[PDB]
Amino acid sequence: CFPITLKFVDVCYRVRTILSGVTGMISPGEFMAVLGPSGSGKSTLLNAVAGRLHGSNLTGKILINDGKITKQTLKRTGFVAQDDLLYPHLTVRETLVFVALLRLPRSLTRDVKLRAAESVISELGLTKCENTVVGNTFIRGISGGERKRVSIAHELLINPSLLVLDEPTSGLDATAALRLVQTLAGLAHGKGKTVVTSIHQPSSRVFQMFDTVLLLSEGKCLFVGKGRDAMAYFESVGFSPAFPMNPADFLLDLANGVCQRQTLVTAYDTLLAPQVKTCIGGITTCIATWFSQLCILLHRLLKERRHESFDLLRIFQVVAASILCGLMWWHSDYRDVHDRLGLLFFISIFWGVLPSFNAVFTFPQERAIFTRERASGMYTLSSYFMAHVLGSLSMELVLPASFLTFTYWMVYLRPGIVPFLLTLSVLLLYVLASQGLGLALGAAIMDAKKASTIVTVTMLAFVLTGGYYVNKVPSGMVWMKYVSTTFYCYRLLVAIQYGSGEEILEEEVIGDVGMWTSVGVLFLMFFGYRVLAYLALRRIKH
Amino acid sequence: CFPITLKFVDVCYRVRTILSGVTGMISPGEFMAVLGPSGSGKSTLLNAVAGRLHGSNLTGKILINDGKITKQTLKRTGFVAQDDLLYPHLTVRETLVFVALLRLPRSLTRDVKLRAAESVISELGLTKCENTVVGNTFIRGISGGERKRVSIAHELLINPSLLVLDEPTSGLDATAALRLVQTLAGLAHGKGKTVVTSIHQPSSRVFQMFDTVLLLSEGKCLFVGKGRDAMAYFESVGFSPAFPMNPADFLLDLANGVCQRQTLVTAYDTLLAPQVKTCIGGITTCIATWFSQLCILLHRLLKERRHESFDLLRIFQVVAASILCGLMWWHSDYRDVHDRLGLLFFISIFWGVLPSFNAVFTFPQERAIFTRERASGMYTLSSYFMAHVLGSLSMELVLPASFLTFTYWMVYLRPGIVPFLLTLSVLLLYVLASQGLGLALGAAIMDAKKASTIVTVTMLAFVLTGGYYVNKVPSGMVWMKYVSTTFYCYRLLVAIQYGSGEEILEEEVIGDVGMWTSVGVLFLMFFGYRVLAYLALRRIKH
Ligand SMILES: CC1=CC(=O)CC(C)(C)[C@@]1(O)/C=C/C(C)=C\C(=O)O
C-alpha cells in the first residue's frame, strides 16, 4: 500500500574512480538486473543505492520517491548481502522465530510476531524443510539453494518495499538458480515490490526473466533499457553476433572491449542517455526492554553453548584425567604431605588450563555475525555480552563438579560434608576466574591462532610462580606470584585440608597471604576480566 | 609419431546403474567434450575410459587402437583430475623440475630430464610466472587459472597421446575458461593428440571450440555427433528453441526432461546409434635407485619442514620459556635439592609435550597428495617414509639446542664442558624419542582432531607416573612408570647433576633403574615408534 520509485542521477565514486557517470530510474513492479564484468563496480552501485556508502567521496542525487535518502525511508529497504551468516544448530523454523522476535517492534503482541514468521515460511518454498537443522559444511543440514532462501526470509520479516540483493545465484546449480529467480520475479509482479539484483553469469532462460537491464564496463554505463530490445539497439550502432549465442553473453562481451568500447560510450551519451533525463518516560521502559532482549539471546545460544562445552572429545579428556587421579592417589594417607600437596597442585593446573584455553575461540568465531546483526537495530553490545557471560558460567560448571565428586572419595581427602562443599566452592570459583582470562585475550586480539599462543605463555608464567616448583623465589620476582590465579587457588586448597599446623606437626603448609584475602582476589579477577573483555569489544568502533 | 584411436562400445556400470548403454569412437586430432546434467554419470565415463574402473561391475569392450586396454598402452594416457594437489612453498619452476626427475626414466641424462621440464613451461603459458611461489589460500601465490595450467603440465612431461581431463574450467572466470580451452584445442590440432574433457556449463564461444559432443541423461546417451549439426539434428525430431539461446543450453535442457526425454532415447537407437556401429642383475641397481629417490624427496620437502618447524609462533613460545627458566632459577645454588629437581622436571615436561603434539599433523595433511603420487610410478612408501624421518630429525634439533645453551649458564648447573655435553645429549635423545609417539598416533588414526586429544591423554599418563608428583605409587601401578618416556629422561638428568650421593649427603636422588638401562630404552623407543608408524601406513592398502 506504499510504492517506491528509486531515482539516481549520480556521478563518480573516487576511492581511481570506481563509478563515473551512471544514471537511471526504477519504477514499482519492475525486476531489474545489473550485469557487467568482474571488477566493474556493479557491487558498488547496489551498495551505494541501498544507503551504505555516502559522505566522504560519493556525490550525487540518489533520491527515493521524489525526495531524499533519510533514516525514515530506510527501514523499508532490505539489502540481502552476498554471504550467509546463520547459526548451525538451530532449525529453519527456530531461526526465523528468534529473528522475528528481535526485528519486529515491541508494540505488537506475541501472537502476530510469530504469525508473521509463519507466512514468510510459506511465501518462500521453505515448508518441506522447516524442521531440519541449518548446519554448515561440518553438520549435515539443508542444501545450499535453501540457505540463500532463508537469508532472503531474514529481510522480508520487516516487509520491505525495495529489496536489493547482491549476486543471489552464485554457487547455485543450473536448476535452483532458475527457480530462485522465478520467485523473485513473483515478488515484483504479484506483490508490487522493486527488486534490484546483480547476476554474475546468467544462463539463457534466466535472462528471459528480466524486465530492465543495465551494463557497466569499469564505471560508465552502456545500455539502460527494457532488455528485450537490447539486441535491436546494438544492431543500430553496428554490432551483431556472428554465431548463435546467449544474449546475456554478447552484450557482456561488448563491455570488456572484445569486438567482432570506445564507440559504445560515445553513442550512449548522445542517443540514449538524454532520454531518461527527460523523465526526471523512557526510564522503566528501557529496563524491561533490555531484559527482553536478553531472554531471547539466551535461548538462541543455548544449543551453541551446549555443543561448545559438551563436546565428545572434551568429555573423554576429563574422564581420562579423573581415573588417573583416582588410581595414582588411590586410598591416600593424610600424614605424608609431599604426595598430598602434589594432588592439590595438579588440580590447580588442570582446571586453569582447560577453561582458559577454550574461551579464546568464543568471540573471533562470531565477529562477522555480530557486526551484521548489531547494525540492523536488533541488539546493542551490552546485551550480547551479558548473554555470553551468563550462558557460559552455567554450562562450564558441569564437568568440574563431576570430576571432583568421583575423585574426592577414592583418593581419601578430608571426610565430612563441610570440607567437601568448601573444596567444591574454591574449585568452581577458580574455574570462573580462569575463563575470564580467555575472554579478555580472545577479545583483545581477535585471532584464534595468535591468541592461543599468548594464553599458553600466560598460563606458563602462572604455573612456575604458583609456589610448588620453586621455593626460593630470587628476591626480584616475588611480586610475580601475586597476579597469578594458580597461587590463590592452591593456597586455599591446602588451608582447607590441613588448616594451620597443630595436627601435622617444612612450612609449605603454613601460608603467608591469608584465607579471606585469597577469596577476595578471585572475585576481583572474576569481575576484572569481564570488564577488560568489554572494553576491548567497545574498541572496535563498527 | 604414434596416434591413438579410442573405441568404446560398453554396457552398464551397476554399483542402480550409473551408465547403461553408451558407445562411440574418437579419432586422432579431435577435441571432444562430454556434457550433461549434474549427477548424470559423465564423471564415470571418463574415469572408466582412462582405465581406473574395471573388473568388478564394469563390462564392455573399451579397446585402445584396435586392441585391448593393457599396462603397456597405459603409460601414454594422462588423467588430469579435478582437484589440484601441489606443495605451496615451491616455485613453479621448482615444482616441475622435481616432478620431471621422478616421472621420466633413469636411462636419460640429467641434461634432457630438466630440458623436458623447460619446453613444457613454454608450451603452456607458464613463462611469466615461473618464479613466483605456488601457494594456496593462506600464502599469496599464483592465480587459480594457472594452478590448473600447472596440473596439466604435470601430465605432459611423460608426453601422453590421450589426455583425459575432468572439468578443467570449473571455478575459473569468464576469460580464463576461454583461454584454457583455446590452448587445449591447440594440442589436438597442432600436435595430434586426442583430448577428451567434460565441461560443466560452457558459455557460447567455448561451445564453438568443440569438434565432437556427447550428451548423457542418467545413463543412456542422446546424441554423439559433430556438434555443429546438433541443432540441425534435433529439429528433424521435432524440437527447437523458442527464444535466442546458447546452443549448449538447449540440448542440456533436453537431457533432464524439460521440453518446450522418452522420445529422445527411442529416436537415437533407431536413427543414429546403428550408424557409428558400422565403423566398428637388479641387485646393486635397485639400491642406487632407492637413494636417488631419497635425495630428490629431501630437497622437495626442505622448505616444508622449515615452515613446519620454524614457525614464528613456535619460536616465541621457546623464547618465552627460556627467560622464565632463566629468571625463576637465576643463580641457583646446588645444595638445596627440592628446587633443583623441579628445574629438571619442568624441562622433561616441556620437551616431551611440544615435539609430540606437533608431529600428529604431519601425515593427515599429506595423505591426499601421497596416494596420487604413489600410484603413478614415482615412489614407494619406504622412500617417502624415510624422507619424513630423516627430514624431521635434522630440523627439530635447533630449538632445544638453543633453549639449553641460553639456560644452562644463567641457572648455574654443573660447570665444565663434559657435564654440559651429557645434558645436551640426553635432551636431544628425549626429543627424538618423543616425536615418534606423535608419528605413531598420527599415522594410526589419520585425523588431526581425534589424534590431538589422544596424544594429550597419553602425555598426561606419562607425567603423573614420571616420579615427581607422587612418591608412593599404590602397589598396582608400579608397572605404569616403565613405559613412560618422561621417567627415563628425568632419572638421567638427576644422575648427571648429582651422581649417587657422597657429596649431597631423602632418596629421590638415588635412583633405582640404572644409567645404561635408561639410555637403552630410549633407543628402543626411538626405533620402536618409527616401526609402528610404518606398519600403520602399510595398513591403508591404497
Ligand atoms: C601434559 C598435559 C596435558 C594435559 O592434559 C593438560 C595439562 C595442562 C594438565 C598438561 O599440559 C600438564 C602440564 C603439567 C602437569 C605441568 C606443567 O605445565 O608444568
Residue numbers in the entry:
A (entry chain A), B (entry chain C): 35 to 49, 81 to 325, 338 to 357, 377 to 601, 626 to 662
Give the original sentences from the paper that presented this experimental model.
As a ‘half-transporter’ with only one NBD and one transmembrane domain (TMD) in a polypeptide chain, ABCG25 forms a homodimer as a functional unit, similar to other determined ‘half-transporter’ ABCG structures including the human cholesterol transporter ABCG1 (hABCG1) and multidrug transporter ABCG2 (hABCG2)39–47.
We also purified ABCG25WT protein with DDM extraction and ABA addition during the whole purification step, and finally determined an EM map with an overall resolution of 3.2 Å. The protein structure is almost identical to that determined with DDM plus CHS extraction, with an RMSD of 0.25 Å. A clear density was also observed in the identical site in protein sample prepared with DDM plus CHS, which can be docked by one ABA molecule with a better fitting density, further supporting the ABA binding site. ABA lies almost at the middle of the TMDs, with the carboxylate tail pointing to the bottom of the cavity and the ring head group pointing to the cytoplasmic side. The surrounding residues are hydrophobic or polar in nature, including Q413 on TM1; F442, I445, V449 and F453 on TM2 of one subunit; and T552, L556 and V559 on TM5 of the other subunit. In addition, as in the apo-state structure, Y565, Y564 and H434 seal the TMD to the extracellular space and form a gate for ABA release.
